C-alpha cells in the first residue's frame, strides 16, 4: 500500500508517526521503506525496530491479560468468548511476527554484510521467533524455539568476533538471548551465566569509551543487572 510513496517520505513519516505515538502507522511506513529494496541505515534500522516492538508489545500485553483470564476460567463456565478473543489477539500477533520475519528473510538479512547490520537483523529474528514461542503450543513449538535459538546464536557468534563487549547491539542481543534462556528455553542457569559474563566483560571495556558511549553501554548493563537481581 506504500508502493507509490517515496522512500524518503516514508522515513520522514515514520519519524512523525513516532512523535505522534502512532506505532501501527510507523510500522507500515517502515515496512514500505524496507520494500523499496535498498539496505537500511543505522537510523532506519532503529525506526523499524521501534515501530514493530511497540506494535507487538501492545499485542503481547493484551495476550497476557486475556491468557490470564482464560486460565482462571479453567480452574463458572462463561462460554467460548474468552478463548475466542484470546485467539483473535494471538492470530494478529502471529501475523505481525510473520510480517517482520518476512521482511528479514526478503531480503534484509541476506544483503546485510557488515557486523552491525547483520547482528541487528539476527537479533530481530530471534526476538520475533521468541514472541511466536511465547504463544506457541502445537506441533511446531519446538521448531519455533529452535529458530529463535539459532538466530540468536548466529548473532552472538558474529558479535563476539566483530564487536567490542560494550557495543549496544551486542549488549542488547545478549540481554534478549538471556531472557530467551530464562523464559522460553527453561534454562535459568544459562540465562544467569550469560547475563553475568556479558555484564562483567562490558564493565572491563568501559574505560575505552567516550562519555556518550559510556552512557549508552551502562544503560543496557543496568537491564542485565536488573534481571540478575530478579533471578538470583
Amino acid at each position: 500500500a506504500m508502493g507509490s510513496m517515496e522512500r524518503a517520505s516514508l522515513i520522514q513519516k515514520a519519524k512523525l508517526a513516532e512523535q505522534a505515538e502512532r506505532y501501527e502507522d510507523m510500522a507500515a511506513f517502515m515496512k514500505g521503506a524496507v520494500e523499496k529494496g535498498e539496505e537500511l541505515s543505522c537510523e532506519e534500522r532503529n525506526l523499524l525496530s521501534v515501530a514493530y516492538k511497540n506494535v507487538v508489545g501492545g499485542q503481547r500485553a493484551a495476550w497476557r491479560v486475556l491468557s490470564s483470564i482464560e486460565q482462571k476460567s479453567n480452574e463458572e463456565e462463561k462460554g467460548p468468548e474468552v478463548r475466542e478473543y484470546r485467539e483473535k489477539v494471538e492470530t494478529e500477533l502471529q501475523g505481525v511476527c510473520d510480517t517482520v520475519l518476512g521482511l528479514l528473510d526478503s531480503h534484509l538479512i541476506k544483503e546485510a554484510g557488515d557486523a552491525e547490520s547483520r547482528v541487528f537483523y539476527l537479533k530481530m529474528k530471534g526476538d520475533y521467533y521468541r514472541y511466536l514461542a511465547e504463544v506457541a503450543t502445537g506441533d511446531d513449538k519446538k521448531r519455533i524455539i529452535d529458530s529463535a535459538r539459532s538466530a540468536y546464536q548466529e548473532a552472538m557468534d558474529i558479535s563476539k568476533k566483530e564487536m567490542p563487549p560494550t557495543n549496544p547491539i551486542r549488549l542488547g542481543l545478549a540481554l534478549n538471548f538471556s531472557v530467551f534462556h530464562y523464559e522460553i528455553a527453561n534454562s535459568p542457569e544459562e540465562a544467569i551465566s550469560l547475563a553475568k559474563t556479558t555484564f562483567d566483560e562490558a564493565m572491563a571495556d568501559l574505560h575505552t569509551l567516550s562519555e556518550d558511549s559510556y552512557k549508552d553501554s551502562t544503560l543496557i548493563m543496568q537491564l542485565l543487572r536488573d534481571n540478575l537481581t530478579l533471578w538470583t
Partner: peptide, 7 residues
C-alpha cells in the same frame, strides 16, 4: 517477568 531490551 524480566526485562528484555527497551529504549
Amino acid at each position: 517477568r524480566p526485562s528484555s531490551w527497551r529504549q
